[PDB]
């Protein structure tokens, strides 16, 4: 009974491999051999604030690009100013394992997660003035990865147990569950009309996922090693992968195939963290080298380079106008750059 | 304007207790527990005083901070380097496992081991070796033979002879000789000096790292 | 919940001393800076002195600089204002502002409840108008001049609005220049520019009634105006 349904699925996936095959007329390589190239770039340090004591996981910007906050395995969160270098808030945590945070839109929460297992939100204008913890949301076995909000209600996670979530914040229930993975869920980005989002998991697969209905609407695969980071372009219609075989991808919803690839045969160490740019012509990566990377989008020559820590850079941000980046590494300290 | 020097004045604040804080904490030391299943994981925490679960207990003004990590079920590759600079490992390996299995648990424990040990990630860090049951182990040997599970074994019925084997087997298989030390003892189930054991060793891995770190050698 | 009272005046001989006390109750005192406000009897706003968290930056004015005392406790969550001496111009009721200081903070919040005293170069704004006539169901316009400029090179302007209810304890409604506050109405807006300020109010309301305050926080020497009557016959 089972070697009908096995055969079914071996014909049925020789089948799909089939019919994307002969839609591949042409490549991306060959069209894009008549532009003009961007040159060289450099960039340079523009802010250094230190206020941290040990290894930054996570930093997630703000909306009006001014505040930003920042998590360290210290056991604290800090909320920097990033006009004047001063520090807002200081909130204490209960667990010192943290692998993830995140900004609400309108600027009135944080979140925060781990190894513990529990994704906690905390509000921050409160008449007392003091942050205080407001929901603990529970009932995932792995360890979570990212999280995001998309409105003052409702927030999604990713866990190491190949599951992703989606919960409203009254009550502490799950309200939509995402499955289908192998491997460990490493990363997610959250769509601009935010309706949809993708994911990255350990097995060298990227999903995209149905947010209002609930299931996975198309598969990517190609890469030869774990997934750890994922980005979204500001069109809607791209996405962008690293990889710990060091190497970048580039994939389009409207296509399913991979298009083009980052790598070099100097390059060996692998990529921990992406973020995309404004306009779609750089984009940025963290790399197990010490180094920052920065990337054409339309050809795989590499534009321009950064190096300013002492220790591997774990966090990459950038604001909503694309006009400057934050770096956050292994040697507690974390910087901008314009 | 006021604003700027009151915020700033009130960053100098934060900034003076974060200072504060992360003196007082980076004095206390951090041990991990790592094992294979039914074994000592569960005594020898008891005899010290969901995911990460964690322990404090004080001995002779230390603080000991001791992170169990079994209860994961994922992949130990993406999260083991969180604890890199860890003062040492307590692994705990079945000692009457050579007749059960479920592919023998003894093979399953120094697989394990092996892993642990030769990680990139622990290169200067230490290992405490605790052969968790014996109160037992003693009749189980007067009953059954070890050769079962070593073929190639051979010796008397002693459990001092099987006790040192087993010791010796499991510390050849550590590559490096000179960066790292692996110390063993023998754990019963009414043993009250375990906690004295694990404060000599890491006393002494204090005072070398010490010395080691600045000082001479 | 927030919750700020004041001890402390009465009758007292000229050449005195005199301490009033201000204490708290549940909101975070150790992270309030505060200031101290005095009104004559028949109208007008002064600043007296400020204190920082943490016993730090302690200000005062150009009148009160070698006679006041202000020192607070942040256990038991107090403040204290100690007078030396005490004049004719003396006379006057004092009011307790909390405030915080970061870049969404929203400084001079919350007012206590003020306690009476009877003893028996500098910015100007003018506030040229004193009394409007007004009915309800239409819009008013209050106006108000400086002297400099009080657009800062931060692109951000420090321009406060009061409003005094006859019987009530002053409340925020426009901290910094077209910024609302909390728990008003939209109905509110400055929109101004310049040098010359407005205020603009699209609808009254029956609870309108009170007197308007301008003030200006780019030099630490504060000067408040005239007032705006709405007699809203």
């Known amino acids: 009974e089972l070697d009908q349904l096995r055969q079914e699925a071996e014909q049925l996936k020789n089948q799909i491999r089939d019919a994307r095959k002969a839609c591949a007329d042409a490549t991306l390589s060959q069209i894009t051999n008549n532009i003009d190239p961007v040159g060289r770039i450099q960039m340079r340090t523009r802010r250094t604030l230190r206020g941290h004591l040990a290894k930054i996981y996570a930093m997630h910007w703000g909306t009006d690009s001014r505040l930003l906050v920042s998590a360290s395995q210290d056991g604290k969160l800090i909320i920097w100013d990033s006009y004047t270098t001063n520090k807002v808030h200081a909130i204490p945590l209960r667990s010192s394992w943290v692998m993830t945070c995140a900004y609400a839109p309108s600027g009135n929460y944080v979140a925060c997660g781990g190894l513990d297992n529990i994704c906690s939100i905390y509000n921050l204008k409160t008449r007392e003035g003091n942050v205080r913890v407001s929901r603990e949301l529970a009932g995932h076995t792995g360890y979570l990865s990212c999280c995001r909000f998309l409105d003052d209600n409702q927030i999604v996670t990713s866990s190491g147990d190949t599951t992703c979530a989606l919960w409203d914040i009254e009550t502490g229930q799950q309200t939509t569950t995402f499955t289908g993975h192998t491997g460990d869920v490493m990363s997610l980005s959250l769509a601009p009309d935010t309706r949809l989002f993708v994911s990255g998991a350990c097995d060298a697969s990227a999903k995209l996922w149905d947010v209002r209905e609930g299931m996975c609407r198309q598969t990517f695969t190609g890469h030869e090693s774990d997934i750890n980071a994922i980005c979204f372009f500001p069109n809607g219609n791209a996405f962008a992968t690293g990889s710990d075989d060091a190497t970048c991808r580039l994939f389009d919803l409207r296509a399913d195939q991979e298009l083009m690839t980052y790598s070099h045969d100097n390059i060996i160490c692998g990529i921990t963290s992406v973020s995309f740019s404004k306009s779609g012509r750089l984009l940025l990566a963290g790399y197990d080298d010490f180094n920052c990377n920065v990337w054409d989008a339309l050809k795989a020559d590499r534009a321009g380079v950064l190096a300013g820590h002492d220790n591997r850079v774990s966090c990459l941000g950038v604001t909503d106008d694309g006009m400057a980046v934050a770096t956050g590494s292994w040697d507690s300290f974390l910087k901008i750059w314009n | 304007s006021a604003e700027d020097k009151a915020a700033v004045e009130r960053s100098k604040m934060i900034d003076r207790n974060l200072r504060e804080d992360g003196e007082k904490a980076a004095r206390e030391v951090k041990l991990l527990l790592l094992g294979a299943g039914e074994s000592g994981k569960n005594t020898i925490v008891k005899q010290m005083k969901t995911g990460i679960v964690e322990t404090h207990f004080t001995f002779k003004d230390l603080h000991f901070k001791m992170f169990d990590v079994g209860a994961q079920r994922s992949e130990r590759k993406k999260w083991i380097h969180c604890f890199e600079g860890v003062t040492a490992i307590i692994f705990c390996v079945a000692l009457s496992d050579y007749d059960l299995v479920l592919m023998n648990r003894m093979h399953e424990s120094m697989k394990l081991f092996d892993s642990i040990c030769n990680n990139k990630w622990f290169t200067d860090t230490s290992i405490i070796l605790f052969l968790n049951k014996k109160d037992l182990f003693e009749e189980k040997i007067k009953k059954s033979p070890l050769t079962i599970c070593y073929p190639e074994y051979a010796g008397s019925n002693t459990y001092e002879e099987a006790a040192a084997y087993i010791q010796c087997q499991f510390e050849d298989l550590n590559k490096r000789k000179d960066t790292k030390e692996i110390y063993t003892h023998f754990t019963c189930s009414t043993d009250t000096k375990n906690v004295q054991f694990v404060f000599d060793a890491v006393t002494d891995v204090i005072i070398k790292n010490n010395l080691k770190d600045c000082g001479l050698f | 919940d927030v919750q700020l009272v004041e001890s402390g005046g009465g009758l007292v001989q000229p050449g005195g001393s005199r301490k009033l006390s201000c204490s708290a109750s549940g909101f975070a005192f150790s992270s309030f800076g505060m200031h101290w406000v005095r009104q004559a009897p028949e109208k007008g706003l002064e600043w007296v002195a400020y204190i920082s968290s943490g016993s730090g930056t302690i200000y005062y004015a150009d009148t009160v600089k070698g006679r006041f005392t202000i020192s607070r406790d942040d256990p038991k969550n107090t403040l204290f204002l100690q007078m030396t001496s005490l004049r004719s111009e003396d006379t006057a009721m004092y009011y307790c502002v909390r405030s915080i200081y970061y870049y969404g903070s929203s400084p001079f919040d919350f007012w206590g409840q003020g306690t009476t005293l009877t003893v028996s170069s500098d910015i100007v704004m003018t506030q040229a108008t004193s009394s409007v006539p007004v009915t309800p169901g239409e819009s008013v316009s209050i106006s108000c001049r400086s002297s400099?400029?009080?657009?800062?090179?931060?692109?951000?302007?420090?321009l406060y609005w009061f409003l005094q209810r006859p019987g009530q304890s002053p409340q925020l409604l426009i901290y910094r220049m077209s910024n609302l506050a909390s728990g008003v109405p939209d109905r509110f807006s400055g929109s101004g520019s310049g040098t010359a300020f407005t205020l603009t109010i699209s609808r009254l309301e029956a609870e309108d009634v009170g007197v308007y305050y301008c003030m200006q926080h780019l030099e630490y020497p504060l000067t408040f105006g005239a007032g705006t009557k709405l007699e809203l016959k």
């Open positions: 400099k400029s009080l657009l800062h090179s931060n692109g951000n302007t420090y």
